[PDB]
């Protein structure tokens, strides 16, 4: 079966170089052309280029002409994406792609490398809890996490026993820090008569902290 | 004593003749009983038998022309002779056999055609530029071997079709060296550009217009190019009395018969002339190119010399297309073909440097049998060619038929010619079997059991129906 | 020996169609047989020559059949900033066609194909096509693996490798027991000649009409090459199949290439991965050695043997005098892995010009002894140049050096009578194996009918 | 280049629904277009190829038509797995070009947010800064407007926004204001407010405290 498997995630400071890789699985690279995506919330899908590793011949959109740089080794049947002078823009998801049938079709597609350019420095994050003010039948709490870099963070409550009735919303990148928050509700009965905690992990610089949530 | 003509007991005079060349008959009446009317003349002249009464054919040859070889073959209205004697009377008694002679002579100032057939494809471009001054230099060169030179020139390059010929783009079907920085002729499958002419000036002046052409496959098309040269008589301009020489001159692989269907092209070659007013051959995208086997037929039957001019790269392939088809000759040819002059003089040497017997038409009953003599009076048993001559060289065969019993057909004739000649040897066969008694025989004799015999030749023969 | 030469059945096409150029047995869904035949020269809508295949019913009669339909229009895509163009004029549709399960495949070699990019192209040549039918659900599909798009300009700077432009595909076909297509494509490699392989299954999945430009997966194309001796030689001129290496789980491949190594022609056994197993040299230059190939066994031992085809060779008479009259060689494969020997047997024509060897079709068993026997063609042979077509049958030593039974082409001159061949197959359902001849000169198919052996 | 409009930028159906999209090119693209999907934090999958070709493996409920500058993508049926992203690439010229994208979201009837307000934690405030959050959860549609009024007035400097895709159980959508001052300035004032504007009332819910009162 035909399957595109690409690198890692990469995490590189601006200015630095990149080379993703694109490792074809069930078939031979030479086949077909081999493209690259480049993918933005905001931006959209944009084309970067192509290249037939029978011959190494490439065209590029003239926007990534100077940053993207495409070449193929069908020794180790991979196709390669290097992106030179990084920057902030350049953070972005990464796919390569190959037709089905049609010669110039874009039908089967990696899982996709994810780019992320930042000076920032291994931060751990500040986790705030988040107590209501001095009623109702439904009471909702919350906690703030606050000022981490790199991603991701694992967020529970109660070290994951309260699941249901929770939302815990995308990170946003804050002065190249990331800011992440989480709510969570249940009657008033459950709060302060029970204890309710944010379980907070950063695994970059390795921090589990635990804030239990106190009434004001 | 007795003899095998005694012995056989023979019945007739015809049966007594057939016996051995050695018996005779006695066709007197005063012969005794006993007395055997068929045995050696010898031994019936000694029984007293009439000379006249004596059938005893002998095997001789004479001849009936007899013209002289000659010095030159300058001038005449063709009256040359290379062969001599043209024609003799042979005569043959049954199981016997006679012998003969032939001469024949390579012989000194002999007209020459040259018919220059070129390869034009883009890599003869250099080739072109050498060979302005051809008809000059090489008019000066022949002039010391012939005083009737005639030389033409055509060109090929190969068929004008997909794949062989550039389609795409237009532009490239008016001008193939388009996508180059030049500009080259339209392809073109064979074109005739000079007939047969002693004005060797319009051979330079034809040529220095010449221009080559681009085809996109190394084999040529110049098999194509050699059947029209060679079949299209009156249009190329051979002579009837004069040596043929077609110079065949490449740098490239050829295309050979079944080629052609690469271009959807299946028709065989039909090794006729097609090749009209415009000059160019008319088949070329229609009919395929045409066998080793159809060439032999065509250049034998119009007595054309093919001489293979090739450059080293294709020596080799060249000279093993030479050894299927006899009386080829090759020559190594420069990349720019700056030596072709010398190599056509060499080929002319080498062509007119050997005899070669054949005979046509020969009966079943007759067999030949030839000694050879070369050099200064060799004698070469069991061989009917000579090699290594020079021009002014004179060889000669001793020949003997020997006839198998009697043929019933009694008058024949057959040709000795040497090949490439004009000039030949008729024989003229007649086979001596009857006796002369027999024209004078008396059907229904009143001496032959009561007129139901014939009494021929001193005997009583049975008539028809018995 | 047994064909009935007296009550023949004909069939017939246009006049100028060229029916009869190639021809073959067609067996439907439910087993019953009919004659394909191709005419590479019917005219098209345009007015213009782009061949044709016709569909012909089996009856004693015989007389007309009706055509298998296909895509005779030029194609043009612009799709990549470039423009992709098809050209079907004078393609020779039905140049050749072969029979597998209910799929009939025909081949157009000298299709031509182009691609456009600003001012610069492809070059128009001939990349050839095969088209294949399913005639009872009406199922189309094409197959082009020579088409490529790249531009003129790179193949001159890599010194034109891997040029397939002219490759001709389709020129010659067969099919494997398994359902593998292999094309000839004898101007493969600038002229060196290639193969191109893909099963019918992935080529009716792969094809959508419009793309041009499509990727068959499963295909496998034979290899460019830098030796001289393989230049111009037209690997592919003809193809068959057969089991040549003791391993009944691969599928041999046998290549004819009747200009290898400067006109000598030769013959190659391969694998199904173009990896040479045997290679048998001609004779003699320019006898077209490897024209025709034909597998089958012979003699009785149940290992194929191998028929090949040098219709242009030249015998050697009386007075160091050659006679163009062809020549077939008989191969008989050794038992276990051991190379096949000297020919076991030379067959040779007898009339000049006859071009016997020119198509070799085996027959079956035709006199039903046990042994295999076939038919070479001499489609200008016999006492009158009309053609002849001349059966030999097998024995346990390989084949009789004598015909058993010579057949007079019932054409007027120029017919080509025997130029395509097909026998082997039962048509009238009487037991005996019979035998379909092209005379595509005539534009007509005659049918011989296998009898019991008198 | 070649400009691909695609539209809608999303729409709200159920299953079972016929939908269609519709994506316009600058120019004629002659059928040389794909279509494509993207389920929810997953890589992409090829749908069409060729303006109505499907790719193998994609069920035939999906089906693509159009020509010259004018394609649709339909979905008879609508599965609860093709709720997802969706767009159109063409490539018939050099560079290949990408629709805007369109998102098949689950209807549902509205809802009103549940809006909460949280001051600033005892924690944060030690250390230097101030952070207001509001929460808006389990509301529909997804259109909604968030503002912040420090005494009363209007503050847009410093806010940070964050929103939910639909939810799996309900198929509501959340969202999460952050109002960031400095602990100077956060005692400079004394009210903080963020109004809720939504389909389900003319008047925006308000949710508000006071500093130093509780
Ligand atoms: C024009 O015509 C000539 C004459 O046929 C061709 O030259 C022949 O080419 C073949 C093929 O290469 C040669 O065949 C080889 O013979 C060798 C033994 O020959 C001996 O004897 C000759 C006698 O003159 C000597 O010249 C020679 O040096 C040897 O001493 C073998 O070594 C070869 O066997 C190997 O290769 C073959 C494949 O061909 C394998 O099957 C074998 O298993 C083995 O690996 C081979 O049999 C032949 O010798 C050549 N003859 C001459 C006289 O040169 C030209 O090729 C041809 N040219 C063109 C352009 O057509
Ligand atoms: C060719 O020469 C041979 C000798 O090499 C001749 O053979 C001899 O001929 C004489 C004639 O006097 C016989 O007596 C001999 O018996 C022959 N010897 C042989 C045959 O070995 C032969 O006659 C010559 N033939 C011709 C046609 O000239
Ligand atoms: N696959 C390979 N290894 C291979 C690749 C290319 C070739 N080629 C190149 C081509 C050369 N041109 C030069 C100009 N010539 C001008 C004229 O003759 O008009 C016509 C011939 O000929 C060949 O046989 C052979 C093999
Ligand atoms: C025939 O041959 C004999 C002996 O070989 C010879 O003496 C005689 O001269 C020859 N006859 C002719 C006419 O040459
Ligand atoms: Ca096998
Ligand atoms: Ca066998
Ligand atoms: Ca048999
Ligand atoms: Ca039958
Ligand atoms: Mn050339
Ligand atoms: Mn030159
Ligand atoms: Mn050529």
């Known amino acids: 079966e035909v399957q595109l498997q690409q690198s890692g995630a990469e995490l590189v400071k601006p200015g630095a170089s990149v080379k993703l890789s694109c490792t074809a699985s069930g078939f031979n690279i030479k086949d077909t052309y081999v493209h690259w995506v480049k993918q933005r919330p905001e931006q959209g899908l944009e084309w970067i280029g192509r290249i037939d590793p029978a011959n190494g011949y490439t065209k590029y959109d003239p926007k990534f002409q100077g940053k993207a740089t495409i070449t193929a080794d069908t020794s180790s049947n991979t196709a390669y994406l290097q992106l030179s002078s990084l920057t902030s823009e350049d953070t972005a998801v990464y796919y390569c792609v190959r037709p089905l049938y049609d010669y110039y079709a874009m039908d089967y597609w990696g899982q996709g490398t994810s780019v992320t350019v930042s000076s920032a420095k291994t931060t751990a994050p500040s986790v705030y809890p988040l107590a209501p003010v001095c009623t109702g039948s439904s009471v909702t709490l919350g906690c703030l996490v606050k000022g981490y870099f790199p991603e991701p963070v694992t967020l529970t409550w109660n070290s994951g026993s309260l699941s249901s009735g929770v939302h815990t919303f995308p990170a946003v990148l804050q002065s190249d820090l990331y800011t992440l928050s989480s709510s969570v509700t249940v009657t008033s009965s459950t709060w302060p008569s029970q204890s309710i905690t944010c379980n907070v992990a950063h695994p970059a610089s390795s921090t589990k902290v635990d804030k239990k949530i106190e009434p004001r | ?466 | 020996l047994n064909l009935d030469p007296v009550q023949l059945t004909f069939y017939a096409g246009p006049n100028g169609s060229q029916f009869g150029f190639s021809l073959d047995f067609h067996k439907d869904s439910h087993g019953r047989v009919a004659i394909v035949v191709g005419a590479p020269r019917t005219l098209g809508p345009s007015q213009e020559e782009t061949g044709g295949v016709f569909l012909c019913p089996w009856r004693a009669e015989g007389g007309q059949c009706p055509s298998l339909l296909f895509d005779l229009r030029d194609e043009t895509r612009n799709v990549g900033s470039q423009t992709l163009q098809t050209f079907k004029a004078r393609q020779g549709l039905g140049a050749s066609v072969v029979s597998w399960s209910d799929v009939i495949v025909a081949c157009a070699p000298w299709q031509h194909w182009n691609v456009l990019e600003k001012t610069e192209e492809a070059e128009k040549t001939p990349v050839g096509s095969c088209f294949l039918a399913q005639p009872e659900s009406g199922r189309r599909a094409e197959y082009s693996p020579c088409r490529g798009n790249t531009l003129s300009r790179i193949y001159v700077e890599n010194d034109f490798s891997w040029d397939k432009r002219y490759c001709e595909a389709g020129f010659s076909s067969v099919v494997t027991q398994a359902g593998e297509l292999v094309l000839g494509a004898p101007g493969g490699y600038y002229f060196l000649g290639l193969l191109a392989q893909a099963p019918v299954a992935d080529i009716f999945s792969s094809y959508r009409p419009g793309i041009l430009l499509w990727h068959v997966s499963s295909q496998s194309l034979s290899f460019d090459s830098s030796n001289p001796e393989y230049f111009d030689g037209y690997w592919g001129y003809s193809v068959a199949v057969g089991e040549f290496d003791g391993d009944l789980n691969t599928t041999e491949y046998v290549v004819g290439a009747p200009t290898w190594s400067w006109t000598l022609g030769a013959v190659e056994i391969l694998d199904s991965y173009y990896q040479r197993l045997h290679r048998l040299r001609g004779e003699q230059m320019a006898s077209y050695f490897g024209h025709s190939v034909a597998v089958t066994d012979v003699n009785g031992d149940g290992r194929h043997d191998l028929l090949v085809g040098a219709p242009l060779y030249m015998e050697s008479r009386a007075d160091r005098k050659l006679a163009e009259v062809g020549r077939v060689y008989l191969f008989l494969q050794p038992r276990g892995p051991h190379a096949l020997g000297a020919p076991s047997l030379l067959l040779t024509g007898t009339q000049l010009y006859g071009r016997f060897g020119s198509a070799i079709a085996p027959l079956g068993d035709l006199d039903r002894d046990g042994y295999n026997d076939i038919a070479v063609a001499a489609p200008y042979g016999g006492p009158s140049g009309r053609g002849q077509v001349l059966v030999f049958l097998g024995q346990s030593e390989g084949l009789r050096s004598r015909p058993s039974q010579v057949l007079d082409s019932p054409f007027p001159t120029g017919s080509a009578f025997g130029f395509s061949l097909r026998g082997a197959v039962d048509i009238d359902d009487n037991g005996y194996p019979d035998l379909i001849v092209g005379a595509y000169g005539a534009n007509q198919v005659a049918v011989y009918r296998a009898q019991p052996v008198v | 280049d070649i400009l691909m409009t695609q539209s809608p930028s999303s729409m709200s159906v159920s299953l079972g629904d016929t939908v269609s999209i519709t994506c316009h090119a600058s120019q004629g693209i002659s059928s040389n277009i794909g279509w494509l999907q993207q389920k929810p934090g997953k890589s992409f999958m090829g749908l069409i190829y060729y303006g109505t070709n499907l790719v193998d493996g994609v069920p035939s409920r999906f089906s693509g038509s159009g020509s010259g500058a004018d394609y649709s993508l339909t979905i008879s049926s609508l599965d609860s797995e093709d709720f997802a992203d969706y767009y159109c690439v063409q490539y018939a010229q050099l560079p290949y070009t990408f629709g805007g994208g369109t998102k098949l979201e689950i209807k549902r009837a509205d809802a009103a947010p549940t809006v909460s307000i949280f001051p600033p934690s005892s924690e944060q405030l030690t250390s230097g800064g101030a952070s207001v959050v509001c929460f808006l959860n389990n509301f529909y549609p997804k259109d909604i407007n968030v503002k912040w009024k420090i005494d009363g007035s209007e503050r847009q400097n410093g806010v940070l926004n964050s929103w939910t895709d639909q939810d799996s159980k309900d198929s509501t959508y959340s969202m999460s204001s952050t109002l960031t001052l400095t602990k100077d300035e956060y005692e400079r004032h004394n009210s903080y407010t963020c109004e809720a504007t939504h389909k389900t009332s003319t008047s925006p819910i308000v949710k508000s405290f006071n500093r130093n009162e509780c």
């Open chain 2, 1 to 466: 004593g007795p003899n095998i003509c005694t012995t056989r007991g023979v019945s007739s005079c015809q049966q007594c003749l057939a016996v051995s060349p050695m018996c005779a008959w006695c066709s007197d009446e005063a012969l005794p009983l006993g007395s055997p009317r068929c045995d050696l003349k010898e031994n019936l002249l000694k029984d007293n038998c009439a000379p006249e009464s004596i059938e005893f054919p002998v095997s001789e040859a004479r001849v009936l022309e007899d013209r002289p070889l000659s010095d030159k073959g300058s001038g005449d209205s063709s009256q040359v002779t290379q062969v001599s004697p043209q024609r003799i009377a042979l005569r043959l008694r049954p199981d016997d056999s006679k012998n003969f002679s032939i001469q024949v002579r390579q012989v000194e100032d002999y007209p020459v055609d040259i018919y220059y057939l070129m390869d034009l494809s883009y890599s003869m471009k250099d080739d072109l530029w050498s060979i302005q001054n051809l008809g000059t230099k090489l008019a000066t060169q022949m002039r010391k071997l012939t005083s009737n030179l005639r030389i033409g020139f055509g060109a090929f390059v190969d068929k004008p079709v997909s794949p062989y010929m550039y389609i795409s783009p237009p532009e490239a079907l008016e001008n193939p060296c388009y996508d180059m920085k030049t500009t080259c002729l339209p392809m073109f499958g064979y074109k005739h550009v000079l007939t047969l002419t002693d004005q060797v000036t319009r051979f330079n002046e034809e040529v220095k217009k010449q221009s080559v052409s681009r085809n996109r496959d190394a084999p040529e098309g110049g098999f194509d190019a050699i059947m029209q040269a060679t079949v299209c008589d009156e249009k190329i301009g051979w002579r009837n009395d004069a040596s043929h020489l077609l110079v065949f001159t490449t740098d490239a692989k050829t295309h050979i018969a079944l080629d052609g269907r690469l271009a959807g092209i299946v028709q065989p070659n039909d090794g006729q002339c097609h090749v009209g007013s415009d000059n160019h051959y008319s088949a070329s995208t229609t009919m395929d190119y045409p066998s080793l086997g159809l060439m032999t037929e065509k250049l034998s039957q119009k007595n054309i010399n093919l001489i293979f001019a090739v450059t080293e790269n294709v020596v080799n392939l060249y000279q093993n297309y030479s050894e299927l088809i006899p009386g080829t000759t090759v020559g190594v040819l420069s990349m720019d073909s700056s030596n072709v002059l010398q190599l056509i003089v060499d080929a002319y040497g080498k062509i007119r440097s050997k005899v070669e017997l054949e005979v046509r038409d020969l009966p079943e009953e007759l067999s030949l049998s030839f000694n050879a003599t070369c050099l200064n009076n060799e004698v070469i048993p069991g061989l009917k060619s000579c090699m290594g001559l020079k021009i002014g060289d004179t060889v000669s065969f001793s020949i003997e038929a020997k006839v198998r019993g009697c043929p019933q057909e009694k008058e024949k004739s057959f040709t000795i010619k040497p090949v490439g000649f004009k000039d030949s040897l008729i024989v003229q066969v007649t086979f001596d079997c009857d006796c002369a008694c027999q024209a004078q025989a008396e059907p229904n004799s009143h001496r032959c059991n009561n007129g139901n015999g014939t009494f021929e030749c001193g005997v009583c023969r049975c008539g028809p129906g018995w």
